[PDB]
Design a protein around this ligand. Structure first.
Ligand SMILES: N=C(N)c1ccc(CNC(=O)[C@@H]2CCCN2C(=O)CNC2CCCC2)cc1
Ligand SMILES: *[C@@H]1O[C@H](CO)[C@@H](O)[C@H](O)[C@H]1NC(C)=O
Ligand code: NA
Ligand code: NA
Lengths: 10, 28, 250
């Protein structure tokens, strides 16, 4: 399960 | 041109645990 | 990677994760060959039989990674695609001949302890290192076995295999733009790439200048780590002229 990446990466 | 030289290994003259196995296979 | 080991920190600083935006998932592996160019397999983006056809906005490239899932804060860089360039004669219809693609980054990625580009061979690098019995290294976040997922980047060293043994292992039509690698049943040792490893690099360390060169690209195989079966890799030098062309004109 993948951890959320920062929003700026969209 | 700086390629293929890894900061945490070749740049500091350190070897990783299995590179010598590659080297021993290169018998020429 | 099947029957490999946990990589070390910064052991494969060229290692790139092809990541899918929505749903957030691993797409494939890839390699960093300059601060603006990333190499992978064409099938990672285009594979009509499966309805695979990604464009630039479908994905991100993640560099400097080690753990598969975690967001490695202050370590990885996540880059956006400006443009995808797939080999014009890539043969997804029959045998994945010419399984190779280039991807241009929107901005340059900064090098670091964990992020560094690998070299591409020239004719002599190839000729001196693409020899049966010489071992290369394959790395990846793919399946741990043919039929779970690893917590951290995996690595395995595998011997290049003689062309006829490669041909005699499969019904598929093998070309000059591929090679196979893997241990024979009689050698005892094990290891292969597997699904999820696609597009990642096959590298070797030259004993001449002590630099790492990407000789291959994970492209295909029959199962994973199957006795009497070998992994097939894109011959990177054989397609060098095309890599230069694309780099040259874009
Ligand atoms: N034994 C391994 N080293 C290995 C196994 C599977 C992969 C992932 N590659 C794939 O599965 C590729 C992409 C789409 C067609 N495909 C398949 O392998 C399908 N069988 C192929 C079709 C062309 C000739 C043989 C990559 C590596
Ligand atoms: C792949 O997708 C693009 C648009 O997503 C489309 O133009 C192209 O025809 C599709 N298939 C092929 C073989 O390129
Ligand atoms: Na055959
Ligand atoms: Na095998």
């Amino acid at each position: 399960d993948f951890e959320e990446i920062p929003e700026e990466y969209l | 041109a700086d390629c293929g030289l890894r900061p945490l290994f070749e740049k500091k003259s350190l070897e990783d645990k299995t590179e010598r196995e590659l080297l021993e296979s290169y018998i020429d | 990677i099947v029957e490999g080991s946990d990589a070390e920190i910064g052991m494969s600083p060229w290692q790139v994760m092809l990541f899918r935006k929505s749903p957030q998932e691993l797409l494939c592996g890839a390699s960093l060959i300059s601060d603006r160019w990333v190499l992978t397999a064409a099938h990672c983006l285009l594979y009509p039989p499966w309805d695979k056809n990604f464009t630039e906005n479908d994905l991100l490239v993640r560099i400097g990674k080690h753990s598969r899932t975690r967001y490695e804060r202050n370590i990885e860089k996540i880059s956006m695609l400006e443009k995808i360039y797939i080999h014009p004669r890539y043969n997804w219809r029959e045998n994945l001949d010419r399984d190779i693609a280039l991807m241009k980054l929107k901005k340059p990625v900064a090098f670091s302890d964990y992020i560094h580009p690998v070299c591409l061979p020239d004719r002599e690098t190839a000729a001196s290192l693409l020899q049966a019995g010489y071992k290369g290294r394959v790395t990846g976040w793919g399946n741990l076995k043919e039929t779970g997922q690893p917590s951290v980047l995996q690595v395995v060293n595998l011997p290049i295999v003689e062309r006829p043994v490669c041909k005699d292992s499969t019904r598929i039509r093998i070309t000059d733009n591929m090679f196979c690698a893997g241990y024979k049943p009689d050698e005892g040792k094990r290891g292969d790439a597997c699904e999820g490893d696609s597009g990642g690099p096959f590298v070797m360390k030259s004993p001449f200048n002590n630099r790492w060169y990407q000789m291959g690209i994970v492209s295909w195989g029959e199962g994973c780590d199957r006795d009497g079966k070998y992994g097939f890799y894109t011959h990177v030098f054989r397609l060098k002229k095309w890599i230069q062309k694309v780099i040259d004109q874009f």
